[PDB]
Design a protein around this ligand. Structure first.
Ligand code: LOP
Ligand code: LOP
Lengths: 600, 600
């Protein structure tokens, strides 16, 4: 909770400290007035208790002022309460915004392993729950607990000074009883609510499972059994809600019984004190009204405490996400790439594996030269979908040297590297947003003319104008769903916008159509063919790897051989030959079977 | 709303009428006491306002009784309120149960078209919303509206008889003002809450779309843009909640201002009436306390009215689902099948189509003889997945005669028919329940020994004992997910339990493995081969249709020819030949390509 008091009382920002002190003053004055009200009511009652001789005179001003003060005190108490609410909301929402944004800025900075291990739904639920918890905690600790505590103290002091300690004793005892009673009975009612929600979700699941499969529900005549299961679940839910209502009745009745006993006993004490000439009827009114005022705001407090501990747990969970440490950090003396010459990714004595038990890439030592569209190939598990993650600095090498331009990779700024490293991923994503925004994603700092030029260069205009809304469609799960080729050309356009020196085509064409694959390859070779773009195809369908100036083969996480397609295909025993023959026969059978299918 | 007053005041059930009258009596007495309380307080104040001469006497009993009556009246008012709540809950939940069950009993009785047109999520949401609406309507119309109306009337009568009409005028005017103010300001606050929820869902969607695609968020360095979108959405949400809190402050402050003006003006009227020797200070107390009691329960009522109209709309929607009419009804003079001889499904001059525009099955006239495992075959759209729906009486024939045993189908009881008509559907369903229950589904009135015998006959025991929990696994979407063959043998076991005379295998093997298909066929031919089970295979893979005694071919929704496999395959020009050759070459290429794949 300390970090919370750090987000609402920081070091340096005076605006927030002042807003908080103002909320404090408003709270204090609100309670002062809520307690002064009865005193004006009593001064009224004790100024009217005279023997009026002339029943035609006007109301003296000494009493009109008292009545007016009574009214303005009521109004001012409630008003200051609500103003405190408004102000401290202005504060708590700033705190929530700040913490959520700092957390999200961290997550975008952690390593990848910490994201692949953990679940995303869990992270989002944690953020939401911790935020609601901060809100509820500040609420219940400024709106319901601190004010009522101040009021109880003021009331006990009033009743101890004016009349005696007996009233303060009775009031504090009543408060203790009310509190513990409410807490325990609320636990009880929570058990009942849990049971009810369970038995309602059950019935809903049954109704669903029965209406979706109506055909099978009727193919066997089993509709009465379903109605009976539904009746049983509904009866359980009925009984549970019955018990919930009865328990709420017990709760409210017991609370009112407690406060009624307090008020009645205090009326008796005041009525036996009046006999001693000490007090006056106005004092009975004062006591009853003070205690009832104490009673008014206690329902809410007794309710909220139920939720405070879960909210504190959620807050701790959330605040924990920013305590995690980053392993991939900008090593000392960050630099900037030469950014004036071609680039290389020469490896040296590399050894890397996700989990330290099963190494995937072993003693690899190869060379990605300058301006030569190298091609990696192997098996899924032979360490070819990992070169990217290892050059993009998502992980580090275990006793390995990722040498770029004769200089290690752990010496540059991770961002100065990731900014000149572009990728065409296998299954590109699409945010729940437009298609113009998802393509601006490549370089937000772009002019719309550049965006349209690249969208046309990627052969996408025929597919964007074909849609209902021009450049404003809604893509993603929560919207339109386009197929593979479109997504791949979209990712290609993103890359075109990035305009990087080194490109990694991570299986751009994994599961698509033959002619769509050929179109993608044609576009890629028409755009990414200059002699100033180090290209690297992480491919497993050699049908596309024919023009590369260096083909690297990885078996059992080790480099085997190099050379051009025709060069090594003619070499005895090379895996290139077996793989090529297998893929060729596979494509033969594939296209033949597809022709047969479209026949049928 | 009338039907509601029919479900809580039926004709014949005296228990419910009596429970309701008791709730009524409790409500009335609760308000009587909540209004008598101040009179005891005033009798107290006006009995203590004496000149006590001996300040050592005890409290007379004439005042102790008054104080005790005051306390028991408070407690009894609240107690009767809560008892009314409990009782009318005991009633409303019975009503909810009854209406939900009757609705679900109807849906299981409607035709199929009404289910295929409409959406299931919509039906379930409608049921849930209408149920919550019934609950909320009864609540707000027995707990918040009727009681406060009775109390306002009683208060106006009291203040009109005892003192004068001015107080009743002020009180009723105050109530009008409070009501309309609360309504309008609540509409306002609802607008603000809508905006806030929108801008929070937006931010959550952004966080999701950014954490799921973290790889692509980093492959382009676009994390600051994401943080900025998040900051913008969070700022909108912040401002919206600020305005919500300020508006709630305005609301509560205005309400308290209204009631404060009422109380203060009434104190002034009472204090200028006391001058006329008419009233006494106790009357000022009486007035203030009565009006404050009126004020206490009004927040809730002012809130709920927001939700009452949507709830009435939901109730009407729900109650509408039982007004729909059934077209497939048990025609006059329902009968029972002979149930002592083999069965036939001889058609005659049939003509049927889902939508009257595009007929699918035209002038069909064929014969499904007794004990002959007939086989239908054609194209998906040639009218072969419809013979079932038309013999199972999910639809009716347009100028067609579905003759069974020389007698029409519209003459028997739909259930006496559906009970001797079993089906093995293509994609069988699985409820979110066990595997022993989903197999008991076939015949709930079965002995566990029969269930296990058939589960073994279906060659399923190897697949039920292979799982963690024996006969108690959790299947379905919300649980374990088994593959095709298991589901098909499960549906087969269901049928085995039904033990019907006529069976329809509706593409039992559509998309499975070769050996799994052969195993399913072997099981089916081992079980369903007796000479007393009219079998009908609605199949499109003739590789299984070789042993049937009658193969029917449907082209363009018309019967073409008949005969045994070898009989018509040797016939010139028969579609059987083309289809057989195509499927054979297709299976050849399929298995060859699969061998090639498992090579690679
Ligand atoms: C999180 C926990 C924090 C706990 C902090 C609680 C501290 C409060 C403790 C004790 C306060 C009790 C003081 C009451 C003494 C009684 C004085 C009194 O009776 O005066 C009342 C009105 O005062 C009034 O209106 C009573 C209100 C006066 C209270 C002022 C103290 C607050 C100052 C701010 C403290 C941060 C009027 O009485 P009268 O008949 O008009 O004349 C009597 C003499 N003038
Ligand atoms: C959905 C809308 C339905 C609207 C129906 C509302 C009908 C109510 C209309 C008028 C009722 C006003 C009657 C009050 C007359 C005043 C009588 C009165 O002052 O008696 C009060 C207590 O009575 C009391 O405690 C006051 C409560 C008595 C009320 C009894 C009437 C209810 C009967 C049930 C009706 C269904 C005590 O006054 P006291 O000083 O002790 O002596 C005066 C004479 N005994």
């Amino acid at each position: 909770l300390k970090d919370l008091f750090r987000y609402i009382w920081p070091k340096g920002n005076n605006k927030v400290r002042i807003r908080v002190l103002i909320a404090l003053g408003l709270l204090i004055s609100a309670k002062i007035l809520n307690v002064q009200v009865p005193f004006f009511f009593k001064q009224t009652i004790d100024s009217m208790n005279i023997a009026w001789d002339d029943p035609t005179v006007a109301l003296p001003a000494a009493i009109g002022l008292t009545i007016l003060c009574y009214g303005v005190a009521r109004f001012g108490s409630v008003l200051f309460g609500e103003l405190r609410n408004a102000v401290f909301a202005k504060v708590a929402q700033n705190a929530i915004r700040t913490v959520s944004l700092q957390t999200f800025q961290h997550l975008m900075k952690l390593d990848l392993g910490w994201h692949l291990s953990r679940q995303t739904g869990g992270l989002t639920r944690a953020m939401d729950r911790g935020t609601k918890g901060i809100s509820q905690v500040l609420t219940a600790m400024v709106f319901h607990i601190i004010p009522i505590s101040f009021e109880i103290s003021v009331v006990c002091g009033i009743l101890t000074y004016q009349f005696g300690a007996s009233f303060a004793a009775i009031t504090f005892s009543t408060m203790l009883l009310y509190s513990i009673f409410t807490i325990k009975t609320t636990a009880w009612r929570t058990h009942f609510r849990r049971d009810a929600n369970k038995a309602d979700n059950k019935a809903a699941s049954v109704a669903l499972d029965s209406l979706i499969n109506f055909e099978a529900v009727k193919y066997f005549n089993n509709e009465k059994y379903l109605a009976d299961k539904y009746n049983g679940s509904l009866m359980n839910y009925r009984d549970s809600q019955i018990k919930v209502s009865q328990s709420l009745a017990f709760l409210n009745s017991g609370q009112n019984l407690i406060f009624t006993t307090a008020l009645t006993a205090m009326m008796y004490m005041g009525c036996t004190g009046v006999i001693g000439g000490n007090l006056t009827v106005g004092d009975l009114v004062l006591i009853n009204q003070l205690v009832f005022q104490l009673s008014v705001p206690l329902n809410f407090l007794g309710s909220v405490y139920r939720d405070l501990k879960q909210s504190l747990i959620d807050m701790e969970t959330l605040f924990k996400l920013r305590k995690n440490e980053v392993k991939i950090k900008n090593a000392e003396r960050p630099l900037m790439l030469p950014e004036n010459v071609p680039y290389d990714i020469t490896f040296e004595n590399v050894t890397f594996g996700y989990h330290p038990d099963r190494k995937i890439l072993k003693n690899a030592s190869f060379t990605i030269p300058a301006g030569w569209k190298t091609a990696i190939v192997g098996s899924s598990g032979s360490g070819k979908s990992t070169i990217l993650k290892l050059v993009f600095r998502f992980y580090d090498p275990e006793s390995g040297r990722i040498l770029i331009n004769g200089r290690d990779i752990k010496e540059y700024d991770i961002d100065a590297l990731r900014k000149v490293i572009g990728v065409v991923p296998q299954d590109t994503p699409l945010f729940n947003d437009t298609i113009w925004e998802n393509v601006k994603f490549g370089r937000i700092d772009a002019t719309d003319e550049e965006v349209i030029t690249v969208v046309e260069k990627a052969q996408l205009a025929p597919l964007i104008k074909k849609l209902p809304q021009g450049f404003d469609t809604i893509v993603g799960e929560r919207g339109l769903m386009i197929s593979g080729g479109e997504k791949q050309r979209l990712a290609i356009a993103r890359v075109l916008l990035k305009n990087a020196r080194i490109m990694f085509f991570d299986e751009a064409t994994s599961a698509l159509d033959t002619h769509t694959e050929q179109a993608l390859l044609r576009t890629i070779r028409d755009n990414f063919t200059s002699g100033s773009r180090t290209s690297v195809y992480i491919a497993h369908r050699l049908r596309t790897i024919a023009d590369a100036d260096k083909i690297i083969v990885l078996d059992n996480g080790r480099v085997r051989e190099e050379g051009k397609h025709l060069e090594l295909l003619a070499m005895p025993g090379s895996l290139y030959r077996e793989l090529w023959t297998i893929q060729e026969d596979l494509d033969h059978l594939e296209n033949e079977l597809k022709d047969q299918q479209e026949l049928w």
